Amino acid sequence: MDEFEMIKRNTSEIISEEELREVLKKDEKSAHIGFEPSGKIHLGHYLQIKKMIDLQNAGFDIIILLADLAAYLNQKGELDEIRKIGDYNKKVFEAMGLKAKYVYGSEFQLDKDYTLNVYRLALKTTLKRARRSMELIAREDENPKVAEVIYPIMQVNSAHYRGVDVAVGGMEQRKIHMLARELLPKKVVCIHNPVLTGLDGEGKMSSSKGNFIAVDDSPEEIRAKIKKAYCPAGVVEGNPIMEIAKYFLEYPLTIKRPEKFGGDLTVNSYEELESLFKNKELHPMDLKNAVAEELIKILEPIRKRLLEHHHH
Amino acid sequence: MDEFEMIKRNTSEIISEEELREVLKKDEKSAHIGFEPSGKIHLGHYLQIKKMIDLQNAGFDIIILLADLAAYLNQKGELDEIRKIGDYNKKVFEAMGLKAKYVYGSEFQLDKDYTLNVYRLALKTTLKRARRSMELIAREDENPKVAEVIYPIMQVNSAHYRGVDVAVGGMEQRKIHMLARELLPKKVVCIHNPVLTGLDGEGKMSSSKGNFIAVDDSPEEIRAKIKKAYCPAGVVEGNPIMEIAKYFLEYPLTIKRPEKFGGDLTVNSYEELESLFKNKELHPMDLKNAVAEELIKILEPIRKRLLEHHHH
Ligand SMILES: N[C@@H](Cc1ccc(O)c([N+](=O)[O-])c1)C(=O)O
Ligand SMILES: N[C@@H](Cc1ccc(O)c([N+](=O)[O-])c1)C(=O)O
Ligand code: NA
Ligand code: NA
């Protein structure tokens, strides 16, 4: 498995593979992702940081944009408070092992030259296109604000202004990114990560829907959340427990089971696990027990580095 | 006729008269109007400059905003070219006798603090409200751009940032101004001037519709435009020739007529003229002849000051 395949593993799409292969040849290459600061950092965040770590191991310089001004435009509160949550998010990302440079959007997004570029992009971007690009990002609002359509053209310009070769985000970002590839003179390579399902199966995982596992959740909290989660026997699509097994667990995986239910089970890949589960040879309760315990172990170093700050 | 009545003469509305009366007491008071730079300066412009002259004679300091960045957002071209047309407009306004200070929007509208205020207003302004406020201003576009809804919140902030007591414009501006009175901490007094009808009677006078008299039109051009204009006998509403008589001509007015059509006629007010015209005692051709000749005389000093620049 080469650098390209390491980077591609567990992504939903790369726009485009040819372009990424051209980028990989260079000595100096940079990748960025932006996050609206979030009160809790969850598995969806961690999935994306893992991908940034992959890029870093492939020789990319990594920039994490703490997207305070975007969050402001998307009604997350006052800038100063948003920034404070951004600094907390930085500490969490650092506790995940990421080696990166961190920047706050507002440090450069209010510059005269940046704003003139935003207004130039505003002339090229239809309202209808801008609204469509925000459908999976915008805060729910019965009376959508002008701020909602400034946000996407802020994010288009972000990638241009900073000279990144690669932009990374979730599939929710893909329409903004396709606008960026259409309007900017240098085409940014876009790597999109899958969107995790919420624990109750009812929609996508998100910080505002309370349907997530946070990286610093206690072991007892993780077990409780997994025990209650949607996980129907034999169904893999939209199954959040199988998603965690695919995206976070290491293989070969040993699933402990009582002898009366078949005894311990060693699975050499996620793909073998999917077969066992679809063929009803693995029961949800046993999948859940293994996923909970292996996830606790995966997150333990992150939680204890954040716990050391308090001191024990 | 006091200062308040001089200011009110020939306006469509003052929001509000009480507030204007409070402003009139102060020693230091300022009024501004903004114009997207226009290749031709026409009677609609002149109507508004006349009102600014009224304010100046009432002790207001006058600021003329050459609204280059607004024009840019409203698809009038590149900033540098727009600015050049702005400097031409300044020379025309100066040739009208206005004593004022001139500022280009872009000189202050790209400042960090200005932009942060725009984004704060964008959070308070619905898309639906912003689009409604632009219906009579926005350039025709089958695919309206994000720039269209940035424009109104640029103009709201303009009045705030510069600390004007009074904003002046045409009735087309009134929805943006009512947004400004609703969102800003200091309520700006708004003076709205009527919108002139186009020469062919079919819509409002505007630079893009080629339905105007320009202040530097030749005498032969003015006569030709008036001769062809909509002017039905006995009808005053939507009659552009009667509008010119109301808003530009001085009274008492002597209308020269052949003896066979009643001989010369002296009218002591626009209101007496309206009665004569509605009662079919004054024929369109004779109204047109008087309006053309008195308008030529009114504009002659403006045209010859602009002609002196060439040199004769
Ligand atoms: N859209 C991202 C935030 C973001 C990503 C990348 C960006 O460049 C910017 N930005 O420019 O403000 C913002 C989110 O949903 O969290
Ligand atoms: N809306 C005006 C132009 C204008 C007036 C006042 C203003 O403050 C600004 N502005 O802020 O750019 C622009 C027009 O139709 O010509
Ligand atoms: Na090298
Ligand atoms: Na005094």
Curated annotation (Swiss-Prot), chains A, B:
NCBIfam families assigned: PRK08560.1, tyrS
Gene: tyrS
Effect of residue 107 to T: Confers specificity for the non-natural amino acid O-methyl-tyrosine
Residues reported in the UniProt entry to bind L-tyrosine: 32, 36, 173
Name this polypeptide is given: Tyrosine--tRNA ligase
Key word Cell membrane present: no
Molecular function terms from GO: ATP binding; tyrosine-tRNA ligase activity
Gene3D superfamilies per record: HUPs, Tyrosyl-Transfer RNA Synthetase
GO CC, alphabetical: cytoplasm
Key words of the record: Aminoacyl-tRNA synthetase, ATP-binding, Cytoplasm, Ligase, Nucleotide-binding, Protein biosynthesis
Entry function: Catalyzes the attachment of tyrosine to tRNA(Tyr) in a two-step reaction: tyrosine is first activated by ATP to form Tyr-AMP and then transferred to the acceptor end of tRNA(Tyr).
Binding-site residues, ATP: 207
Subunit structure: Homodimer.
Reaction it catalyzes: tRNA(Tyr) + L-tyrosine + ATP = L-tyrosyl-tRNA(Tyr) + AMP + diphosphate + H(+)
Documented effect of changing residue 288 to A: Decreases the rate of aminoacylation more than 200-fold, without effect on tyrosyl adenylate synthesis
Motif ('KMSKS' region): 204-208
SUPFAM superfamilies, A to Z: Nucleotidylyl transferase
Family: Belongs to the class-I aminoacyl-tRNA synthetase family. TyrS type 3 subfamily.
Top-rank EC class of the record's enzyme: ligase
Region (Interaction with t-RNA): 228-231, 283-288
Annotated region (Tyrosine), positions in chain: 151-158
Site (Interaction with t-RNA): 143
InterPro entries: aa-tRNA-synth_I_CS, aa-tRNA-synth_Ic, Rossmann-like_a/b/a_fold, Tyr-tRNA-ligase, Tyr-tRNA-ligase_3, Tyr-tRNA-ligase_arc/euk-type, Tyr-tRNA_synthase
Lineage of the organism: Archaea, Methanobacteriati, Methanobacteriota, Methanomada group, Methanococci
Motif ('HIGH' region): 37-45
Subcellular compartments: Cytoplasm
Enzyme Commission number, as recorded: 6.1.1.1
GO biological process, one term: tyrosyl-tRNA aminoacylation
